[PDB]
């Protein structure tokens, strides 16, 4: 990730000019920045882009050697035949997977140039290569991954240190703010305009609002000002941490539970970069014993789950290629919305959780396309599906299921479908049903270890 | 990854079919002393000790690679399983 | 002869001696009795004419994966004043055996924030990051475990201990009631006029590598653009954060790494102390398994969710063997011994 | 119990790849010599590179030519890619013309022969020309080593002209890698492999051999004191 | 409740004598104890720490008796506290029950003060569990120190009120699990209670009263005191402990030193002249390195 | 010219232990070029000599105390480690030193029995404090090597009851070079280099750097004859 962003320079941003050498004079007088934001004549440009063009990456990357630019800075590059506007890293990043499948014109197509490479898109590159390329040259592909980014983070500069966690500025106007408006319930309920209940729900719904400002403002001060600070990257890319741990050691603490379920009037004011008094530190000692008495009373209920479902489906095998049955079901694309009484589409992931890998069991005509019956719907024919129904053409589509299967002691192959870890059609012999059994009570477990203890398993173990 | 794993996994109907004639395989090269073989001499696998370089005891390793040429043949109810060994031993005695 | 050199006359090991696995302690013989030779035992005694003694080897010996030096024996003998033995036995001989244990991979280290791991490497003095002044850093950490866990006490301790380290002097800070930022940014400030004010008396300006740094610092917002190569070097410093040199290479980090002196422990769960294998040992006595345990070299267990990773892969022959042929056939394990072999 | 000097192995494919394994080596001496060969490598082979062209009816770099597809920033990222190697030591920068009429395909074979002067890709697209175009074009080709901006040299010959980068290095790319190896009971040791890429103008091993004396020369230096 | 003890270092025996446990005859069950018996009373302010306790199915049911507390002769748990009247501080020091602390406002130790009157006008207090801001002629107690609402092994942590519950409660467990080294040293950063910790572990030896050192041995030390009497202390040398950690003293002292009541004799295991010594101080840097 | 001038070669010493080295001037780049090999090659294989084994009468192992005296066989053994030994003789290769003390008294390094082509360079370094009645009789090798070598490697034992020690053979103690920016007519882009060697004394920091040159210079000849 810290190779594939590019910098952001504010000095210049929204000068003006009439020929490109007039822009590059500018620059060397110290006026405008190598990647501040400017218009030439019509178009949007940066320094960068006209004072370096490079013939091939061999010869940006020499220039990397000797330090004329960086790798975060935009320039103009010509590779594959055109003249990309990008930074040196990008350039870089494309050559690491040319080279790991030694195929150019593939390794193309299966990259995001333009965007910084984050947890989620490195993720669509390993599964798009997967279907073209196979298990032998994924594997390779990952080392390459591996090798390369354990180099780069350690030559980077990522340390932490006590002056990272930026207090904002905004921190201190929205307390005083929540103190003006305590003092004004306070004085309407001694007048009694409201309830004890009703002055104790106002309370908490005010220091509600004004956590979820702070939250605001940590992110967006990180953005505008140190869009390279460690805690910020960190969490950007995806390598550690969560927004609500952020904003503990940036922010405030936040409100507090009792032990018997009923909330502290006084939140913590202070993070854990101020540090809390002892007063504080008590108080929010309350729930993290609850957080580790539940993790231990827990995990036998949810083990317990993973040998009953085992020990019900442990003979589900994949005995023969077609059972023969006309039966099937009908997967929806859209749901009732009951708030608003009528009929939207459904999320995307939840309509891939259903349809990914199944035997189409009716003949489907979608936008052109003839879906023919008995085909394997692969991850590309569910986009297609989604988009039909985008454009009102498709309701709902008919499949192949386990529920509908008529073979004795198991399921065949054509109503189970895909081998999720194969991406291909299941072979004949597979214990599925050991599989599903694993399949749904890893999660489970795993979660209660670490909501959950809320109508989450005890809500699926009544189901 | 095995090398030529890809093209293995399309030779077969099921996954666990490869796996039955690869193990079977190689319990007959065992048994023959890889007399039995049908790779060529510069095509048998070879290890690397400190006296030099020697074949390959591993008979795992030389059936993958004898399935990657073609020259084996794979199915049910090919031969009588009696006549097979018989005929085995005639060839190849050990 | 060899084996039985570290013996005295009464049969215990010397004092002072060096023992290894399979190593013998202390001999003992005991009384073989009464038994029925193999008729092939018969005639191997017979041709090489070798009468058969009526005792046996029972001597106590080092446990594989043990050792060390000898340095105490304690010998109990029956009548002896306070010593109470069991009915039936006649003396019981001890031995300590003491080593000089040094850190390795696979020990366990922490402070006293919750911050713990095992040592995975061990690096040579010149591949280690080091000072512009030559100093060489002891011990690298991850900085991805702060964030999500909230320990930022480790972080508070490494900048105070960067100041004492050139101050040379300690510290008392109570908790909820001691040292704060601006009370350690200033203690900051003296250790900089030490460790920057030595290199101008000696006669050395700015190195070049610094000059590269300090740019990059700039862009990142760490340090105040306009100001000298020293004021800017003197900011990073009350940041806690120093340019750091690359051992291999020569060249510095490309950005300002947090230095300082912190308080680590070794922990008592040492890699050398739970390392364990087996071929083949002691069984059970009704169900024919092989024991557990490390102290009776046991074997592994294999319990029921392993059983059902096996299933779900579709290694039929793989379980089978772990079934029968390695833990209660007992004539599939001695014939498949036998194989092998 | 000094180690046994090492074997030096070469795999060298072409005139422009070449691979070289050194084994086996003390701890950490992989890292020890690996490291300045590829910075005198990447930043100390003499070469040759084009510094200034003229171009006939053009005012600036941004500007563009009728009857030709490229514009000035293409044909000058050609130019950039150009191989030339002198032949006599003694000379020391040339001048090269060029002119061609329309709708042919320039190319680099058709600059005018010039006396101890070798052009290693012949077969390099300059330019494409149509009906009624014109392309006079006049490069001036220096020596040197390492990568030298535009901005920096600054170099015209005459007034319009542009200056160009100059790519001197022949060298495109170094790599190299370290890995353990063990010989009996020693498991310590290192075994270096160094990748080499150039333009052709020298062959990769022979640019190993001048990277290897230069450091020899330096280490001299320690010689007399004041 | 009759436990193998646990000798690591001295630091791991004293804490395993102030531990509190609800099982044995007569308490409770592992497997049959609910949620209430593990959670954390407001009443164990000041009586039982908040933080120690192990993880896992013995949670929030073997706890540690807090720094300050002591218990009183029919079993009940107390805490010190200050006597606040008219709005100064004084100096009488009341230990009082749970149910005797219920009936009164008892203000936080980081009052400011000038002299021993309170300064501020608005002061953070608690009434029977609860924070509150009252005025200081509404307080009439005060606490003694931060330090008597967590137990020892947790007041030995720096920079504590920095550092998330979760996380303290790992720190001051693994300080049981350390080993003494043949080069301990005392920590750079301190809080203040290493030198207590070693004199009350009886692991080293002081002199008893005021003499001059005659005799100083790897295996005794000989002091003539003022009186005349001699004494002669045996050390401890390389001996096994119930945990396989060899305790050694090593003497401090020289032929004819005077010393005091209470100087320093001999350096008992994991101790550094007389302070807790459980690791080594070593320069740390903080960055990824290569994958390792 | 393109070609720069010899650079001038600059010693500045203090004593035996401590010397600073200034080549100046050179080509942008050739401060980290040549630096950086150097410093590896100093700090890992220069000779030296360390104690490889002691022995001391009437005692079996090193986890014993001794009777008169207030330090343990561990601490005594640490306070070896710091012992510097120089030998005047190339040929030599392992020496052996002898002390007899009787008690009351602090015994030092200078208590050593003289040997020919043997100097002691730390004379004050204290090694074992004697109480009346107290006696010390002990032999101590000194070997000559490279590197860092366990007593769990060597094993060496001259006697007995002697009592292997870890070597730590390395006479270089901290390394450091420095790189400033000078110039040389209009070209303002060269490199100055300063090198800074911090020994022990029995190797002074100039003999240092001729042996590490030296190496470096022997390594570059191994790309010499291709084996392909
Ligand atoms: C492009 C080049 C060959 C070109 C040619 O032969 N002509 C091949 C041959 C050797 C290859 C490197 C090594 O594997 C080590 C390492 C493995 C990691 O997985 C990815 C990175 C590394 C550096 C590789 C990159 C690249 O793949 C190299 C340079
Ligand atoms: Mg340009
Ligand atoms: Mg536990
Ligand atoms: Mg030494
Ligand atoms: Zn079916």
Redesign the pocket.
């Given at each position: 990730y810290y190779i594939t962003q590019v910098r952001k320079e504010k000095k210049g941003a929204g000068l003006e000019f009439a020929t490109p050498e007039e822009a590059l004079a500018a620059h060397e007088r110290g006026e405008v920045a190598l990647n501040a934001p400017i218009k030439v004549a019509g178009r949007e440009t940066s320094v960068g882009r006209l004072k370096y063009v490079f013939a091939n990456p061999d010869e940006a990357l020499l220039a990397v050697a000797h330090g004329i630019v960086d790798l975060q800075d935009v320039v103009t590059v010509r590779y594959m035949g055109k003249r990309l506007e990008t930074s040196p890293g990008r350039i870089l990043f494309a050559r690491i997977v040319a080279?790991?499948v030694e195929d150019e014109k593939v390794a193309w197509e299966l990259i995001q140039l333009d965007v910084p490479q984050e947890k989620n898109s490195l993720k669509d590159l390993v599964y798009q290569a997967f279907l073209r390329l196979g298990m032998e040259k994924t594997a390779?592909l990952l080392?390459?991954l591996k090798?390369?980014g354990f180099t780069f983070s350690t030559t980077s500069g990522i340390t932490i240190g006590i002056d990272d966690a930026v207090i904002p500025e905004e921190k201190k106007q929205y307390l005083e703010e929540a103190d003006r408006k305590l003092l004004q319930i306070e004085q309407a309920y001694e007048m009694g305009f409201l309830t004890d209940r009703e002055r104790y729900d106002q309370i908490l719904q005010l220091w509600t609002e004004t956590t979820e400002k702070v939250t605001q403002a940590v992110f967006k001060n990180f953005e505008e000002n140190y869009p390279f600070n460690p805690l910020y990257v960190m969490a950007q890319s995806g390598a550690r941490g969560n927004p609500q741990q952020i904003r503990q050691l940036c922010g405030l603490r936040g409100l507090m539970q009792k032990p018997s379920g009923e909330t502290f009037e006084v939140p913590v004011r202070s993070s854990f970069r101020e540090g809390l008094t002892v007063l504080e530190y008590f108080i929010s000692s309350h729930g993290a014993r609850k957080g580790g008495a539940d993790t231990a009373l827990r995990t036998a209920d949810s083990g317990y789950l993973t040998r009953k479902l085992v020990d019900v489906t442990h003979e589900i095998v994949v005995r023969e290629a077609d059972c023969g049955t006309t039966n099937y079901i009908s997967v929806p694309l859209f749901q009732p919305d009951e708030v608003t009484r009528s009929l939207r589409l459904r999320k995307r992931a939840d309509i891939e959780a259903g349809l990914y890998g199944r035997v189409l069991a009716r003949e489907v005509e979608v936008l052109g396309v003839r879906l023919e019956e008995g085909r394997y719907l692969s991850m590309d024919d569910v986009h297609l599906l989604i988009k039909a129904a985008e454009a009102g053409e498709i309701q709902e589509v008919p499949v192949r299921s386990p529920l509908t299967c008529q073979t004795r002691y198991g399921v065949c192959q054509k109503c189970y479908g895909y081998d999720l870890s194969m991406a291909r059609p299941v072979s004949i012999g597979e214990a599925v049903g050991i599989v599903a059994a694993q399949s749904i009570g890893e999660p489970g477990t795993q979660l209660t270890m670490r909501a959950d203890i809320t109508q989450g398993l005890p809500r699926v173990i009544e189901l | 990854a095995e090398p030529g794993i890809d093209k293995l996994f399309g030779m077969v109907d099921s996954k666990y079919r490869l796996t039955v004639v690869v193990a079977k395989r190689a319990q007959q090269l065992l048994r023959h002393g890889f007399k039995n073989t049908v790779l060529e001499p510069e095509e048998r696998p070879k290890m690397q000790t400190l006296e030099g370089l020697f074949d390959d005891p591993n008979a795992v390793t030389w059936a993958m690679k004898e399935l990657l040429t073609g020259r084996l043949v794979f199915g049910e109810n090919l031969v009588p399983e009696d006549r097979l060994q018989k005929e085995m031993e005639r060839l190849y005695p050990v | 002869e060899a084996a039985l050199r570290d013996l005295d006359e009464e049969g215990v090991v010397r004092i002072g001696a060096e023992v290894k696995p399979g190593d013998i302690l202390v001999g003992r013989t005991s009384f073989k009795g009464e038994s029925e030779p193999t008729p092939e035992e018969r005639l191997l005694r017979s041709i090489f004419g070798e009468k058969a003694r009526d005792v046996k080897d029972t001597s106590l010996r080092v446990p594989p994966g043990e050792g060390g030096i000898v340095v105490r024996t304690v010998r109990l003998r029956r009548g002896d004043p306070g010593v109470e033995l069991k009915p039936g036995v006649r003396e019981v001989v001890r031995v300590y055996v003491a080593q000089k244990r040094k850190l390795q991979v696979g020990d366990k280290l922490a402070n006293r924030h919750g911050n713990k791991g095992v040592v995975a490497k061990i690096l040579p003095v010149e591949d280690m990051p080091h000072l512009p002044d030559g100093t060489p850093v002891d011990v690298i950490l991850n900085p991805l475990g702060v964030p999500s866990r909230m320990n930022l006490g480790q972080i508070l301790e490494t900048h105070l201990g960067l100041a004492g380290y050139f101050l040379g002097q300690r510290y008392i800070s109570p908790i909820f009631d001691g040292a704060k930022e601006p009370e350690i940014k200033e203690l900051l400030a003296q250790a900089f006029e030490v460790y920057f004010g030595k290199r101008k008396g000696e006669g050395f300006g700015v190195d070049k590598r610094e000059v590269e740094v300090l740019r990059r610092a700039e862009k990142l917002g760490l340090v105040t653009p306009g100001k000298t190569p020293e004021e800017q070097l003197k900011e990073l410093f009350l940041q806690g954060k120093v340019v750091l040199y690359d051992g291999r290479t020569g060249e510095p980090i490309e950005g300002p790494i947090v230095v300082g002196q912190m308080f680590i422990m070794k922990l008592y769960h040492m890699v050398e102390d739970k390392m364990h294998a087996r071929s083949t040992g002691p069984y059970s006595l009704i169900t024919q398994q092989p024991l557990g345990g490390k102290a009776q070299f046991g074997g592994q267990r294999f319990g029921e969710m392993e059983v059902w990773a096996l299933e779900a892969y579709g290694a039929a022959h793989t379980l089978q063997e772990m079934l029968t042929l390695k833990s209660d056939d007992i004539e599939g394990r001695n014939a498949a011994y036998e194989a092998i072999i | 119990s000094k180690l046994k000097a090492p074997v030096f192995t070469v795999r060298t494919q072409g005139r422009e790849?070449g691979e070289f394994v050194l084994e086996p080596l003390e701890r950490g001496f992989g890292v020890t010599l690996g490291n300045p060969l590829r910075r005198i490598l990447l930043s100390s082979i003499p070469g040759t590179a084009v510094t200034s062209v003229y171009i006939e009816d053009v005012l600036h770099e941004f500007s563009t030519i009728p009857g030709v597809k490229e514009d000035v920033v293409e044909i000058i990222l050609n130019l950039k890619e150009l191989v030339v190697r002198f032949l006599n030591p003694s000379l020391q920068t040339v001048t090269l013309l060029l002119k061609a009429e329309g709708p042919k395909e320039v190319k680099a074979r058709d600059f005018l022969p010039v006396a101890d002067v070798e052009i290693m890709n012949p077969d390099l697209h300059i330019a494409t020309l149509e009906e009624g175009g014109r392309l006079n074009m006049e490069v001036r080709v220096d020596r040197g080593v390492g990568y030298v901006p535009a901005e920096k040299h600054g170099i015209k010959d005459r007034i319009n002209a542009i200056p160009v980068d100059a790519v001197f290095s022949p060298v495109r790319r170094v790599?190299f890698?370290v890995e353990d190896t063990r010989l009996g009971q020693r498991t310590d040791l290192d075994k270096l492999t160094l990748?080499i890429w150039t333009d052709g103008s020298v062959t990769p091993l022979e640019a190993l051999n001048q990277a290897v004396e230069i450091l020899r020369e330096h280490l001299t230096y320690f010689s007399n004191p004041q | 409740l009759s436990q193998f003890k646990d000798e690591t270092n001295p630091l791991s025996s004293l804490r395993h004598k102030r531990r509190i446990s609800a099982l044995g005859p007569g308490g409770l069950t592992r497997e049959r104890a609910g949620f209430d018996v593990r959670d954390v009373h407001r009443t164990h302010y000041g009586r039982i720490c908040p933080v120690e306790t192990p993880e896992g199915a013995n949670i929030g049911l073997i706890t540690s008796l807090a720094a300050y507390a002591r218990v009183d002769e029919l079993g009940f748990i107390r805490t010190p506290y200050r006597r606040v009247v008219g709005g100064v501080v004084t100096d009488e020091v009341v230990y009082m029950t749970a149910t005797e602390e219920d009936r009164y406002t008892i203000a936080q130790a980081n009052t400011p003060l000038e002299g021993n009157r309170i300064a501020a006008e608005r002061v953070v207090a608690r009434r029977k569990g609860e924070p509150v801001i009252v005025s200081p002629e509404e307080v009439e107690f005060m606490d003694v120190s931060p330090k008597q609402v967590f137990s020892v092994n947790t007041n030995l942590i720096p920079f504590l009120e920095h550092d998330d519950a979760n996380r303290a409660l790992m720190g001051s467990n693994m300080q049981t699990q350390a080993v003494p080294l043949i080069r301990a040293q005392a920590p750079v950063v301190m809080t203040g209670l290493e030198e207590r910790v070693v004199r009350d572990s009886l692991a080293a030896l002081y002199a008893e009263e005021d003499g001059e050192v005659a005799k100083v041995d790897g295996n005794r030390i000989v002091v003539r005191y003022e009186d005349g009497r001699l004494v002669e202390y045996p050390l401890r040398r390389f001996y096994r402990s119930n945990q396989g950690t060899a305790l050694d003293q090593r003497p401090r002292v020289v032929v004819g030193q005077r010393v005091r009541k209470g100087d320093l004799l001999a350096d008992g295991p994991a101790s550094e002249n007389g302070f807790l010594a459980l690791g080594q101080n070593v320069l740390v840097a903080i960055m990824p390195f290569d994958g390792y």
């Open positions: 080279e790991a390779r080392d390459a090798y390369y | - | - | 790849y790599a890698q990748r | -």
